[PDB]
């Protein structure tokens, strides 16, 4: 069922008219992430009982897969293998002549169409004007998150009818969340739950799926106090800290000794300009050699250049903590970059008993 | 650099100590064979050309078993060539392979199925420019992970330890030996590529020789613009039409001869010669 | 975030930007106000920026990956000031503080 | 034939004999047997130490699949111990295919750079677990089912490109009804990295849950306790090797396989070096079959000669002349050494049990630190021993009796041969605390003695630590610099003994060339360098000198000290 979705359904039903009637060649529907584009159109197609083929662009990452899946599903509605778009057109013309497919409109629903512009140059224009080429009462629908402005080819093509799905509001979200109430408690209880949850999280999280997931996760802790023995104040006081702890994470859901010194030296080399290096290390007044010199200066003990330190360097490179810049074949002048957050390096320096802030030129 | 061919007449110095050094090195062969045969791979590092010691070890101890020698210092060697050689002789297979990884899979499966096959590897100068690829060393380590393959390698480059990672270190299972032989790197520097002008200009027409001489003279004086060069060539009567001058310029270009990419000192020496 | 981006585009005339500057000036805005309820950490703002980039209102320059993270990446805005003002006028429940910050 | 243009050359034509002999054969057999036992025990411990997580994984998978009868996903933190993973992963699949599902497919990141290859490898391994696209996989699952789930293991996601990950997740989300799917993640770094790889639009489709694995330090302590501080193995190690292995482990890799390899190399070298290492009942019977040359070798031992010096002149003559008496006396000494090992291990374990509850841990927390500090010198001769005793003298009675209960558990477990009266007194119990402390101190003085103080220890100990250092931790740069600077150490030619840093003209061409290069600027002019080299070698001829200079320059360029530059003609950087 659909809630707070009555204008778009009525518009689509008026557009379709009767089965023997014709319609637009191309309709482009765009909206936000949680607008329910997939739900509404699929429920409408199931209700009207129309011959429709549902296709995911991501699943059909190759042209042959797309055409073969379309043809196979259409045949099942009524093995076939095709390779070129012209062959697909010819086979579609051959297959559409069924009695069940004689005086009825054929619908090809495509979702996640954002990748279609990266598949082939002429595939999208061909799909746009399918009804002219086939001349067989065919309609093609588009679902996407990007506006039509960026789907326009350079040469220009047959403009589809553009449609927008309205964004949700507080009342609509509350109604949708309160529809699927658990049967073991009163509807007003779940309504109050949804109300407090929205009052806490609506500022950031407007995603229906995410908010519903959060409600499902946190309901068991909501229902504990009454089990333990309609007390709004009692429930709110018992439940507030848990809600704050949950809001701490909305969207989120021990190195070796010398490795720490290597990491801190790499951070210093990356974020400190070379001109000041001696100013921080020379007792009197990035390339690999600079790193080695800085490491030798920092460590109070004399470290021998054993191969194990080079193995540590390569292991750190593999662990995606240090990024290699130069060519892989050039292993005599290699370049490196450090990608560690500053809080992490401060924590590791604290565990090492080292004060990195005293050496950071930018902070000084 | 042709003089190099005549430079081999210099006698060595202090050869007695080198003789005792080689005699001392010769005694480790049995221990090296024992360590290989138990599943360890050995790297030789040290100053001096160690090719002679490896050849002595081969001709002394490896004349009774299957063994493959790859002298990686040759700049034309690639890992695919080694794989093709192994497939064509060790397994006597001629069928081509769709990819390197498929060839590795076939070799691994064949050696795992046939436990009666033992192979020895003798690699010279593992630090070669063509063997420094990460996939190259990964392939070699995957090959050496088998218990039916024995690996002796040599290091002559300073930054060698950066080649091996922790996983690669585990796969290779290295043991090290210091063997400094002080031998000159004659053969290993021979194949490496670190006169032509005179030979080219000998059989060219004298007008082209004079034009090239004038171009060299102007270049040594201080690139020429086309108009000034054409006017000067007119003044010497070596050119009758700009089409002919452009034809001579294209002839010079075809031999990779406006700036001349030739050193000034070489031009000065060539002018008087 | 969009208002902060507009302020950056106004102060630095037609120059790119990254995540750190936007985060720093958003922190400045929330710290100048005494005790407003906008205490958010880095990861949530990072996710919001990722979503904004996903909607293709912001596009990278000279695309590359690995060498440069999502942070420290040169971003540009694909909107006009009058468009932002007109859209903000029709916003249902825009708070007073953010409106005045936008005007400032 | 080994010098042609083609670089590919190929040629076609008992284990114990390479070790040479009867003593060699026995040594090799003992080596193989001991290595077998050691690695078997290592595998036993490896399997044993993961049940508390394997059961959790099994129950989580059962709970997740119960709903099928949102993609379930388990996050497993495994640390930086890159060498361990594979072994653990082995046992991992040996659980799943044994308990819940016979479909386990582990995948690498190296072999899947593109999604096409990813799906190809996945379906290829699914084929023998019993164009390519998801419909084919669904059809295969339907055929094989006509309901076990499918298990996929991602080992190193750090090397995985993101795009294939998001594509696979978004594709698999829409076909969960068609066939179940569960992901297992292997993360070496902190779990936070998962937030930096998947955009939230993809992350929202996964129900991730977090597990954590065993720490490496506890693994090392358990291995050390089970394999060295026990009485089941006759081999023992001196302090130097223990310190060097501990340094390598704690400073380099936190890996246990490197330690095992070092131990195996130590055992191999020990059996290669000492002929007398042929030597509980096995040695008892082998003593009877001793040879005269081995008798003389025993007579030559330093500990043996000190012990002979200890005894009287008549006993000295009897030992130096008779053979059977020597055999019997060595047998008795070996039994005494065995008893010393037994009571040393028991006393050290009890002492660590006492020390474990001491605040601030004056002598360490784990077995290894106390063991090595006892091996270094006598503990009782150090003031730190007095500090430890006076800190022990401040314990509260309840914690004291808890410590005594733990010690009593140790006694009842494996203190079986000596001093049950100790446990009896512990049952009986400031004056009493002082008596207990003094008795413990007396035990420490009596039983904690270095093994080097006893004769015939060299049979079961190894001491060539520097060779182990040079064979495991190579220093190519140090060795190369030593060869370049002072070749006297390699040649013993008095002509090279002048100073340190001065210029021995008599030295070979490469050495003098390198030394001249060292003192010059950061950019080396080739003509000036050649002139200097000619001047040095001076103290037909010109061409020969130029030849030597060119050869030395080419050699140094090959070794990597030389990188040419085109900014200035004939110049090189370091
Ligand atoms: N108007 C609505 N009425 C009732 N349920 C809705 C409505 N909109 C969304 N839902 C529910 O929310 C769920 C998730 O919404 P989706 O259908 O995934 O949104 P979407 O617009 O299709 O975005 P995409 O394309 O899947 S990323 C649906 O499966 C429905 O159960
Ligand atoms: Mg959808």
Residue C101: Cβ within 10 Å count: 15
Beta-carbon pairs below 8 A across chains A and D: 80
Burial group, residue B127, by CB count within 10 angstroms (0-12, 13-18, 19+): buried
Q: Which residue in the set D11, D110, D483 is minimally distant from B47, CB to CB?
A: D483
Q: Is the dihedral of CA B207, B213, B219, B221 positive or negative?
A: negative
Cβ-contact B111, B83 below 8 angstroms: no
Contact D532, D505 (CB under 8 A): no
- Using a CB-CB cut-off of 8 Å, the residues of chain A touching B164 are 307, 310-311, 314
- Those residues whose C-beta lies under 8 Å from the C-beta of residue B159, and which sit 6 or more positions away, are A331, A332, D560
* B165 vs A315, A329, A331: nearest CB: A315
Ramachandran angles phi, psi of D107, nearest 5°: -130, 155
Report CA-CA distances (Å) from A157 to A11, A108, A114, A125, B143.
25, 19, 17, 6, 57
B29 Cβ neighbours under 8 A, 6+ residues apart: B57, B60, B61
Token digits of residue C96: 């007073």
Mutate: best of B129, B131, B166, partner A, most A CBs <10 A: B166
Residue C62: left if φ>0, alpha if ψ -120 to 50, beta else—which one? left
Nearest Cα neighbor of A75 from A116, A43, A106 is A106
Long-range contacts of D480-483 (CB under 8 A, 24+ apart): D480/B47, D480/B158, D480/D559, D483/B46, D483/B47, D483/B180
**Residue A34 Cβ contacting ligand 1 at under 6 Å:** yes
Under an 8 A CB cutoff, do A337 and C67 touch?
A: yes
Cα distances (angstroms) measured from residue C51 to each of C6, C39, C60, D202: 18, 20, 14, 11
| Token couple for D84 | 């361990």
Beta-strand relationship, A106-111 and A138-144: parallel
Q: How many whole angstroms separate alpha carbon D188 and alpha carbon D213?
A: 11
Per-residue CA distances from A122 to A71, A86, A152 (Å): 20, 12, 12
Which candidate, D471, D287, D532, A257, places its Cα nearest to that of B176?
D471
Query: What are the φ and ψ backbone dihedral angles of C13, each rounded to 5 degrees?
Result: -70, 110
* CA A208–ligand 1 middle distance (angstroms): 8
Q: Which of D3, D7, D477 sits opposite B158 (nearest CB)?
A: D477
Q: Rg of chain D over CA atoms, in angstroms?
A: 33
D571: which strand partners?
A: D565
Nearest-CA distance D470 → chain B (Å)? 8
Residue A112 annotated in ligand binding = no
Q: How far is D113 from chain C (nearest CA, A)?
A: 15
Residue with tokens 């044993």: D48
Query: Looking at chain C, which runs of residues are DSSP E strands?
Result: 58-60, 75-77
| Residue A33 labeled ligand binder | yes
Q: Is C100 buried (19+), middle (13-18) or exposed (0-12) by CB count in 10 A?
A: exposed
Chain A neighbors (3+ CB pairs < 8 Å): B, C, D
Contact A70, A62 (CB under 8 A): no
Q: Single out the residue of A177, A209, A206, A182 nearest to residue A194, CA to CA.
A: A177
Atom of ligand 1 nearest to the CA of A5: 1
| CB A263 within 8 Å of CB A255 | yes
Nearest to B135 by CA among B146, B143, B125: B143
Ligand 1 closest atom vs CA A1: 4
The span from the CA of D155 to the CA of D89, in Å, is 9
Return the structure tokens found at B176. 């090290």
Residue D209 phi, psi dihedral angles, 5° rounding:
-140, 150
Could you tell me how far CA D554 lies from the centroid of its own chain? 40
In angstroms, rounded to a whole number, what is the distance separating the alpha carbons of residues A200 and A194? 10
Going by beta carbons, is chain C in contact with chain B, meaning 3 or more pairs sit under 8 Å apart? no
Q: What Å resolution does this PDB entry report? A: 3.8
CA of D209 from ligand 2 middle (Å) equals 25
Which two three-digit tokens encode residue D139? 């059809």
3-state secondary structure of B68: strand
User: What is the rounded CA–CA span in Å between residue D499 and residue A93?
Assistant: 96
What span, in angstroms and rounded, lies between the C-alpha atoms of D438 and C14?
Answer: 83
Which contacts qualify for D83-89: CB closer than 8 Å, 24 or more apart?
D83/B166, D83/B167, D83/B170, D83/D253, D83/D255, D83/D257, D83/D258, D84/D216, D84/D255, D84/D256, D84/D257, D85/D155, D85/D186, D87/D46, D88/D46, D88/D50, D88/D213, D89/D153, D89/D155, D89/D186
**Chain B partners within 8 Å of D547 (Cβ):** 3-4, 7, 10
Q: Does D163 touch chain C (CB under 8 A)?
A: no
Residue A17 marked ligand-binding: no
Residues D59 and D40: their CA atoms lie apart, in Å, by: 29
d(CA A215, CA A209): 10
Tokens of D566: 């085109």
Q: Are A45 and A107 within 8 A, CB to CB?
A: yes
Measure Cα distances from B234 to B228, B239, D168, D466 in Å. 10, 6, 73, 80
Instruction: Give the technique used to solve this structure.
Output: cryo-EM
Identify whether the C-beta of residue D198 lies closer than 8 Å to the C-beta of residue D157: no
A199 is in an annotated binding site: no
How far is ligand 1, taken at its centre, from the CA of residue A43, in Å?
Answer: 11
User: Distance (Å, rounded) from C-alpha B216 to C-alpha B213?
Assistant: 5
What one-character DSSP code corresponds to residue C73?
A: -
Q: In what order do the strands lie in the sheet with A26-30?
A: A52-56, A106-111, A138-144, A26-30, A161-164
Nearest-CA distance from B110 to chain D in Å? Answer: 18
A38 marked as part of a ligand binding site: yes
Q: Given an 8 Å threshold on Cβ–Cβ distance, is D204 in contact with A61?
A: no
Taking the C-alpha atoms of residue D33 and residue D43, their distance in angstroms, rounded to an integer, is 16
C-alpha distance from C34 to closest chain D C-alpha (Å): 32
Beta carbon of A38 within 6 Å of any ligand 1 atom:
yes
Contact with chain A for residue C66, Cβ under 8 A: yes
DSSP for residue C17? B
Is ligand 1 within 6 A of the CB of residue A35? yes
A36 CA distance to ligand 1 centroid (A)?
3
* Closest CA relative to residue D326, chosen from D355, D304, D348, D357: D304
Counting Cα atoms < 13 Å in the Cβ hemisphere of A42 gives: 11
What is the DSSP code string of D372-436?
HHHHHS-STTSHHHHHHHHHHTT--HHHHHHHHHHHHHHHHHH--SS-HHHHHHHHH--HHHHHH
Ligand 1 near A36 CB (within 6 A): yes
CA distance A167 to A33: 10
Task: Tell me if chain C has a CB within 8 Å of the CB of A115.
Answer: no
Which of A310, A326, A177, A315 minimizes the C-alpha distance to A255?
Answer: A315
Q: C56 and A150 in contact by Cβ < 8 A?
A: yes
Pairing of strands B67-71, D8-11: antiparallel
Q: Which ranges constitute the DSSP H helices of D228-366?
A: 239-248, 256-273, 281-286, 292-299, 302-310, 313-321, 324-355
- How many Cβ atoms are within 10 Å of D498's Cβ, its own excluded? 14
Token pair, residue D326, equals 């020597």
DSSP string, D53-83: HHHHHHHHHHHHHHHH--EEEEEEE--S-TT
Instruction: Return the closest-CA partner of residue D394 out of D421, D419, D420, D357.
Output: D357
Parallel, antiparallel, or unpaired for β A322-324 and A336-338?
antiparallel
Q: Which residue of A has its CA nearest to B132?
A: A329
- What is the number of other CB atoms lying within 10 angstroms of the CB of residue A289? 10
Classify each residue of B72-101 as buried b or exposed e, where b means 16 or more C-beta atoms within 10 Å of its C-beta. Answer: bbbeebbbeebbbbbbeebeebeeebeeee
> Comparing C-alpha atoms, which of B83, A39, B173 is closest to residue D10?
B83
Find the CB nearest A251 among C37, C47, C55: C47
**Residue-wise burial string across A157-169, b where 16 or more C-beta atoms lie within 10 A, e elsewhere:** beebeebebeebe
To the nearest whole Å, the CA of D550 is away from the closest chain B CA by 9
Pocket test for ligand 1, best of A5, A6, A39 (most atoms within 8 A of CB): A39
d(CA A88, CA A62) in angstroms, rounded, equals: 14
- Reported in sequence order, the residue ranges of B35-129 that DSSP labels E, i.e. its strands, are 41-45, 67-71, 119-124
Tokens in use for B97?
């392979």
Q: Answer positive or negative: Cα dihedral of A250, A252, A254, A258.
A: negative
B126 touches D: beta carbon within 8 Å: no
* DSSP structural state of residue D10: E
Q: Is A244 annotated as a binding residue?
A: no
Q: Which of A4, A9, A36, A37 to mutate to test the pocket of ligand 1 (most atoms within 8 A of CB)?
A: A36
CB C71 within 8 A of CB C19: yes
Give the burial class of D256: count Cβ atoms within 10 A of its Cβ; 0-12 exposed, 13-18 middle, 19 or more buried: buried
Three-state secondary structure of chain A: CCCCCCHHHHHHHHHHCCCCCCCCCEEEEECCCCCCHHHHHHHHHHHHCCCEEEEECCCCCCHHHHHHHHHHHHHHHCCCCCCCHHHHHHHHHHHCCCHHHCCCCEEEEEECHHHHHHCCCCHHHHHHCHHHHHCCCEEEEEEECCCHHHCCCCCCCCCCEEEECCCCCHHHHHHHHHHCCCCCCCHHHHHHHHHHHHHHHCCCCCCHHHHHHHHHHHHHHHHHHHHHCCCHHHHHHHHHHHHHHHHCCCCCCCCCHHHHHHHHHHHHHHHCCHHHHHHHHCCCCCEHHHHHHHHHHHCCCCCCCCHHHHHHHHHHHHCCCEEECCCCCCCCCCEEEECCCHHHHHHHHHHHCCCCCCCCCCCC
Report d(CA D453, CA B271) in Å as an integer.
86
Backbone angles phi, psi at D72, to 5 degrees: -65, 140
Q: Identify the residue whose C-alpha is closest to ligand 1 atom 9.
A: A36
Q: How many whole angstroms separate alpha carbon D287 and alpha carbon D459?
A: 13
CB pair distance less than 8 Å for D7 and B13: no
Question: In this structure, what is the dihedral angle of CA atoms D121, D122, D126, D129, given to the nearest 10 degrees?
Answer: 70
Q: b/e map of D175-209 (b: 16 or more CB within 10 Å)?
A: eeeebbbbbbbbbbbeeeebbebbbbebbbbbebe
Q: Report residue A233: phi and psi, to 5°.
A: -60, -45
Q: Is the CB of A3 under 6 A from ligand 1?
A: yes
- Alpha helices of C64-104 — where are they, by DSSP H? 81-89, 96-103
> Does ligand 1 lie within 6 Å of residue A57's CB atom?
no
CA of C6 to the centre of ligand 1 (A): 32
CB–CB of D303/D457 below 8 Å? yes
| Cβ neighbourhood burial of D561 (10 Å; 0-12, 13-18, 19+) | middle
Q: What is the DSSP string of B110-164?
A: HHHH-TT--EEEEEE-TT-GGG--HHHHHHHHHHHTSTTEEEEEEE-STTGGGG-
**Bridging pattern class, strands B41-45 and A336-338:** unpaired
Q: Which residues pair with A172 in a beta bridge?
A: none
Please give the helix or strand (H or E) that residue B178 lies within, else none: strand B174-178
Cα–Cα distance for residue pair D62/A111, rounded to 1 Å: 34
Minimum-distance CB partner of A59 among D174, D204, D206: D174
- Strand B41-45's sheet: what is its strand order? B174-178, B41-45, B149-155, B119-124, B67-71, D8-11
Query: With 0-12 CB in 10 A as exposed, 13-18 as middle and 19+ as buried, what is D398?
Result: exposed
Please give the angle made by the CA atoms of A194, A196 and A199, to the nearest 5 degrees: 105
Phi, psi of B181, rounded to the nearest 5 degrees: -110, -15
Mutation to test the A interface, candidates D72, D80, D197, most A Cβ within 10 Å: D80
Q: What is the separation of C-alpha B128 from the centre of its chain, rounded to a whole number of angstroms?
A: 7
CB atoms within 10 A of CB B236: 12
Q: If you ran DSSP here, which 8-state letter would residue C67 be given?
A: S
* Strands D571-573, D563-565: pairing kind: antiparallel
Long-range own/partner contacts, residues B76-84 (CB < 8 A, 24 or more apart): B76/B130, B76/D7, B77/B128, B77/B130, B77/B131, B77/D7, B77/D8, B78/B130, B79/B131, B79/B133, B79/B135, B79/B136, B79/B139, B79/B140, B81/D7, B81/D8, B82/D8, B83/B107, B83/B139
């Amino acid at each position: 069922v659909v809630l707070c979705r009555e204008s778009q359904v009525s518009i689509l039903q008026s557009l379709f008219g009767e089965r023997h009637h014709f319609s637009f060649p191309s309709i482009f529907i765009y909206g936000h992430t949680a607008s329910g584009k997939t739900y509404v159109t699929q429920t409408l197609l199931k209700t009207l009982e129309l011959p429709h083929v549902f296709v995911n662009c991501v699943e059909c990452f190759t042209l042959r897969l797309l055409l073969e899946q379309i043809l196979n599903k259409l045949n099942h509605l009524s093995e076939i293998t095709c390779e070129t778009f012209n062959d697909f057109v010819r086979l579609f013309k051959q297959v559409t002549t069924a009695e069940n497919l004689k005086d009825q409109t054929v619908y090809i629903v495509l979702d996640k169409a954002e990748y279609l512009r990266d598949m082939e140059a002429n595939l999208l224009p061909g799909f746009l004007r399918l009804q002219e080429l086939a001349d067989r009462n065919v309609t093609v629908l588009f679902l996407s998150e990007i506006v039509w402005e960026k789907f326009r080819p350079n040469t220009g093509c047959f403009e589809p009818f553009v449609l927008y799905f309205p964004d949700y509001s507080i009342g609509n979200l509350q109604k949708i969340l309160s529809h699927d109430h658990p049967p073991e408690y009163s509807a007003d209880f779940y309504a109050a739950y949804i109300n407090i949850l929205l009052g806490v999280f609506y500022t950031v999280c407007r995603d229906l799926k995410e908010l519903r997931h959060l409600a499902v996760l946190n309901f068991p802790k909501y229902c504990e106090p009454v089990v333990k023995g309609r007390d709004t104040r009692k429930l709110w006081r018992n439940i507030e800290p848990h809600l704050k702890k949950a809001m701490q994470t909305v969207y989120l859901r021990e190195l070796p000794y010398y490795s720490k010194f290597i990491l801190i030296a790499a951070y210093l080399a990356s974020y400190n300009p070379a001109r000041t290096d001696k100013r921080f290390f020379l007792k009197h007044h990035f390339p690999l050699d600079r790193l080695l010199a800085i490491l030798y200066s920092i460590v109070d003990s004399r470290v021998a250049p054993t191969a194990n330190i080079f193995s540590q360097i390569t292991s750190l490179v593999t662990l995606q903590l240090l990024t290699l810049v130069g060519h892989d074949d050039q292993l005599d002048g290699p370049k490196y970059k450090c990608t560690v957050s500053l809080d992490f390096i401060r924590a590791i320096a604290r565990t090492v008993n080292f004060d990195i802030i005293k050496y950071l030129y930018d902070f000084l | 650099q042709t003089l190099r061919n005549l430079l081999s007449k210099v006698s060595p110095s202090f050869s007695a100590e080198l003789k005792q050094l080689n005699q001392q090195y010769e005694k480790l062969f049995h221990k090296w064979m024992l360590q290989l045969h138990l599943g360890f791979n050995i790297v030789l590092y040290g100053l001096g050309s160690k090719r002679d010691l490896l050849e002595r070890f081969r001709t002394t101890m490896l004349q009774d078993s299957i063994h493959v020698v790859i002298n990686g210092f040759f700049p034309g060697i690639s890992v695919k060539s080694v794989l093709n050689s192994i497939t064509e002789e060790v397994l006597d297979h001629m069928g081509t392979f769709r990819s390197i990884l498929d060839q590795l899979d076939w070799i691994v499966n064949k050696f795992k199925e046939d436990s009666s096959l033992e192979l020895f590897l003798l690699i010279h100068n593992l630090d070669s420019q063509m063997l420094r690829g990460e996939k190259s060393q990964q392939i070699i380590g995957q090959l050496s992970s088998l218990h039916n393959i024995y690996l002796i390698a040599s290091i002559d480059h300073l930054n060698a330890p950066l080649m091996w990672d922790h996983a690669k270190q585990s796969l290779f299972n290295w043991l090290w030996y210091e063997t400094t032989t002080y031998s000159p790197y004659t053969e290993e520097t021979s194949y490496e590529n670190s006169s032509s002008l005179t030979h080219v200009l000998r059989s060219l027409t004298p007008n082209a020789r004079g034009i090239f001489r004038l171009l060299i003279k102007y270049q040594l004086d201080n690139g020429l613009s086309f108009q000034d060069f054409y006017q000067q060539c007119r003044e010497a009567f070596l050119v009758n039409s700009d089409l002919t001058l452009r034809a001579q310029l294209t002839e010079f270009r075809d031999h990779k001869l406006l700036l001349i990419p030739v050193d000034n000192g070489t031009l000065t020496d060539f002018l008087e010669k | 975030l969009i208002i902060a981006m507009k302020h950056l585009n106004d102060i630095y005339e037609e120059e790119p930007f990254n995540f750190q500057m936007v985060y720093n000036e958003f922190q400045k805005f929330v710290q100048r106000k005494a005790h407003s309820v906008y205490n958010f950490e880095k990861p949530v703002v990072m996710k919001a920026f990722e979503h904004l980039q996903q909607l293709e209102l912001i596009k990278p320059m000279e695309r590359t990956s690995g060498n440069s993270q999502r942070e420290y990446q040169l971003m540009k805005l694909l909107l006009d000031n009058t468009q932002i003002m007109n859209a903000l006028q029709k916003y249902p429940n825009c708070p007073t503080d953010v409106r005045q910050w936008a005007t400032s | 034939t080994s010098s042609m243009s083609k670089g590919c050359f190929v040629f076609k034509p008992p284990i114990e004999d390479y070790f040479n002999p009867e003593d060699s054969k026995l040594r090799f057999e003992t080596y193989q047997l001991i290595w077998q036992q050691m690695k078997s025990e290592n595998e036993r411990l490896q399997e044993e130490l993961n049940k508390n997580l394997f059961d959790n994984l099994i129950e989580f998978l059962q709970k997740s699949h119960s709903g099928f009868q949102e993609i379930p996903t388990a996050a497993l933190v495994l640390g930086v111990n890159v060498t361990d993973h594979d072994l653990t992963f082995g046992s991992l699949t040996e659980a799943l295919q044994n308990n819940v599902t016979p479909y386990v497919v582990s995948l690498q990141a190296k072999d899947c750079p593109d999604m096409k290859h990813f799906l190809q490898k996945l379906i290829s391994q699914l084929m023998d677990c019993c164009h390519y696209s998801m419909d084919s996989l669904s059809s295969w699952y339907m055929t094989v089912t006509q309901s076990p789930p499918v298990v996929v293991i991602l080992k190193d996601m750090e090397s995985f490109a993101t795009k294939v990950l998001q594509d696979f997740i978004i594709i698999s989300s829409q076909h969960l009804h068609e066939f179940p799917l569960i992901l297992i993640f292997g993360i070496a770094t902190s779990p936070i990295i998962i937030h930096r790889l998947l955009p939230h639009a993809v992350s929202s489709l996964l129900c991730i849950e977090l597990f954590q694995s065993l720490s490496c330090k506890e693994h090392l302590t358990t291995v050390l306790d089970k394999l060295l501080l026990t009485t089941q193995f006759p081999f023992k190690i001196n302090e130097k090797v223990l310190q060097v292995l501990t340094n390598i482990f704690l400073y380099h890799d936190f890996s246990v396989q490197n330690f095992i390899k070092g131990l195996q190399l130590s055992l191999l070298e020990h059996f290669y070096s000492q002929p007398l290492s042929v030597l509980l009942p096995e040695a008892k019977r082998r003593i009877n079959f001793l040879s005269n040359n081995q008798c003389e070798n025993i007579r030559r031992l330093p500990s043996f000669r000190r012990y002979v010096e200890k005894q009287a002149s008549e006993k000295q003559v009897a030992l130096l002349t008779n053979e059977r008496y020597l055999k019997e006396e060595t047998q008795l000494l070996l039994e005494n050494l065995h008893v010393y090992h037994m009571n040393y291990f028991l006393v050290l374990r009890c002492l660590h049990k006492f020390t474990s509850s001491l605040p601030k841990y004056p002598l360490g927390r784990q077995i290894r630190e106390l063991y090595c500090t006892c091996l270094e010198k006598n503990i009782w001769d150090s003031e730190e021993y007095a500090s430890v005793l006076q800190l022990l003298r401040m314990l509260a009675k309840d914690e004291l009796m808890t410590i005594l209960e733990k010690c009593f558990k140790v006694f009842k477990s494996y203190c079986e041969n000596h001093l049950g009266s100790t446990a009896k007194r512990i049952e009986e119990f400031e004056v009493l605390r002082e008596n207990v402390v003094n008795f413990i101190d007396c035990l420490v003085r009596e039983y904690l003695l270095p093994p080097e103080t006893q004769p015939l220890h060299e049979v079961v100990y190894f001491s060539a630590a520097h060779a182990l250092r040079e064979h495991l931790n190579a220093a190519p740069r140090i060795a190369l610099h030593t060869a370049l600077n002072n070749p006297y150490y390699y040649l013993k030619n008095e002509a090279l003994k002048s100073e340190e840093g001065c210029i021995p003209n008599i030295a070979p061409d490469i050495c003098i060339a390198y030394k001249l290069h060292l003192e010059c600027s950061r950019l080396i002019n080739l003509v000036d360098w050649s002139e200097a080299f000619a001047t040095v070698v001076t103290a037909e001829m010109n061409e020969i000198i130029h030849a030597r200079f060119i050869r030395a320059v080419s050699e140094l360029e090959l070794l990597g000290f030389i990188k040419p530059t085109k900014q200035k003609t004939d110049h090189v950087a370091r």
